[PDB]
Design an enzyme around this catalytic site. Sequence first.
Site, PDB file in Angstrom:
ATOM      1  N   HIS A 160      56.095  60.470 -37.180  1.00 13.68           N
ATOM      2  CA  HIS A 160      55.554  60.494 -38.547  1.00 13.68           C
ATOM      3  C   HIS A 160      56.066  61.934 -39.217  1.00 13.68           C
ATOM      4  O   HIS A 160      55.896  62.803 -38.559  1.00 13.68           O
ATOM      5  CB  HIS A 160      54.115  60.549 -38.661  1.00 13.68           C
ATOM      6  CG  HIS A 160      53.571  59.262 -38.021  1.00 13.68           C
ATOM      7  ND1 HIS A 160      53.733  58.178 -38.489  1.00 13.68           N
ATOM      8  CD2 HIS A 160      52.714  59.263 -37.058  1.00 13.68           C
ATOM      9  CE1 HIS A 160      52.984  57.139 -37.771  1.00 13.68           C
ATOM     10  NE2 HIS A 160      52.469  57.843 -36.943  1.00 13.68           N
ATOM     11  N   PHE A 161      56.392  61.785 -40.466  1.00 12.30           N
ATOM     12  CA  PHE A 161      56.620  63.011 -41.265  1.00 12.30           C
ATOM     13  C   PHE A 161      55.321  63.319 -42.086  1.00 12.30           C
ATOM     14  O   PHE A 161      54.869  62.736 -42.800  1.00 12.30           O
ATOM     15  CB  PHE A 161      57.729  62.938 -42.419  1.00 12.30           C
ATOM     16  CG  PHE A 161      58.140  63.836 -42.790  1.00 12.30           C
ATOM     17  CD1 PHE A 161      57.618  64.471 -44.047  1.00 12.30           C
ATOM     18  CD2 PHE A 161      59.272  64.555 -42.587  1.00 12.30           C
ATOM     19  CE1 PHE A 161      58.176  65.858 -44.718  1.00 12.30           C
ATOM     20  CE2 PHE A 161      59.642  65.798 -43.005  1.00 12.30           C
ATOM     21  CZ  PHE A 161      59.040  66.433 -44.095  1.00 12.30           C
ATOM     22  N   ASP A 162      54.816  64.484 -41.535  1.00  9.63           N
ATOM     23  CA  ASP A 162      53.408  64.905 -42.106  1.00  9.63           C
ATOM     24  C   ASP A 162      53.541  65.667 -43.295  1.00  9.63           C
ATOM     25  O   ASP A 162      52.856  65.493 -44.305  1.00  9.63           O
ATOM     26  CB  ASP A 162      52.593  65.626 -41.060  1.00  9.63           C
ATOM     27  CG  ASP A 162      51.199  65.766 -41.325  1.00  9.63           C
ATOM     28  OD1 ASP A 162      50.601  64.510 -41.325  1.00  9.63           O
ATOM     29  OD2 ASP A 162      50.494  66.792 -41.536  1.00  9.63           O
ATOM     30  N   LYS A 186      58.150  52.664 -52.400  1.00 10.45           N
ATOM     31  CA  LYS A 186      57.666  53.557 -51.592  1.00 10.45           C
ATOM     32  C   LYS A 186      57.383  54.852 -52.479  1.00 10.45           C
ATOM     33  O   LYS A 186      58.237  55.316 -52.773  1.00 10.45           O
ATOM     34  CB  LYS A 186      58.098  53.948 -50.188  1.00 10.45           C
ATOM     35  CG  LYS A 186      56.983  54.728 -49.449  1.00 10.45           C
ATOM     36  CD  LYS A 186      57.732  55.216 -48.139  1.00 10.45           C
ATOM     37  CE  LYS A 186      56.987  56.276 -47.266  1.00 10.45           C
ATOM     38  NZ  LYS A 186      57.703  57.104 -46.304  1.00 10.45           N
ATOM     39  N   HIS A 202      63.410  58.799 -42.607  1.00  7.09           N
ATOM     40  CA  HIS A 202      63.178  60.371 -42.714  1.00  7.09           C
ATOM     41  C   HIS A 202      64.538  61.088 -42.320  1.00  7.09           C
ATOM     42  O   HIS A 202      64.538  62.217 -42.609  1.00  7.09           O
ATOM     43  CB  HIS A 202      62.005  60.761 -41.914  1.00  7.09           C
ATOM     44  CG  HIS A 202      60.866  60.183 -42.507  1.00  7.09           C
ATOM     45  ND1 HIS A 202      59.939  59.674 -41.978  1.00  7.09           N
ATOM     46  CD2 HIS A 202      60.419  60.505 -44.009  1.00  7.09           C
ATOM     47  CE1 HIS A 202      58.861  59.446 -42.940  1.00  7.09           C
ATOM     48  NE2 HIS A 202      59.069  59.607 -44.214  1.00  7.09           N
TER      49      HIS A 202
HETATM   50 CL   LIG Z   1      57.386  61.497 -46.639  1.00  3.29          CL
END
Ligand SMILES: [Cl-]
Length: 252
Positions: free
Chosen positions: A247-249, A169, A140
């Site tokens: 985490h990327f929310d 992904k 990210h």
């Molecule tokens: Cl993402």
Amino acid sequence: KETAAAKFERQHMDSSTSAASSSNYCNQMMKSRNLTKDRCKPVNTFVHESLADVQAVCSQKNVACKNGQTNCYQSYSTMSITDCRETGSSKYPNCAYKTTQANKHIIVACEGNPYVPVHFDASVGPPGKETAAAKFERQHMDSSTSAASSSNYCNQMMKSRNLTKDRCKPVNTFVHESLADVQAVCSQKNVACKNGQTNCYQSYSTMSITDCRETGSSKYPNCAYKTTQANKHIIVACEGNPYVPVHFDASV
Ligand SMILES: [Cl-]
């Protein structure tokens, strides 16, 4: 006056050839790069990748330098490199070297504005294992650039960050801001995550991001993406001590 960045290219860059073909490679390269002028430099590594590929390593996996400094970076992908080791029978000024080719990850020390490699620290063989925070940075974080240059950003980045290895992904966001700015979000507006937990935070400010989303025709192992560049607040989940993103929310 040779800059540190230029000295790194002289001593460690060899893009204009894909690998150490001949067993005399080191013999020639060590000489031409002036590494045998005052003495036969005992050992040296050359990296057979584009400058940009090596330069991007400065925005990859942060690791402790051998000298105790924190500005070292390990490449997410293996690279073609050549180790040169002086032979036992080598005598100056006719320095002699054993040329050794390998595919390994590299570790470089980075410096300056722009932030580029100034030392070669080490090489690492396959494979490795990852912390939540490290994985977040690989998936990210793109601090190197200010934004996307084309609509091929995502095809390139998804692959080079190993996000198309076993499957494509489908969706993934990259943040083009400094690590400290992104890490600072863990102390900003606290919000619930999509999963219902409350360790999520929305950046006070918009940030430069890139949305990579697989195309509807894309199929593994031929993963195709559309690249969308934007300026939005990010929402990250944070965890641990230090309290950093894991985490990327979403972005909003
Ligand atoms: Cl993402």
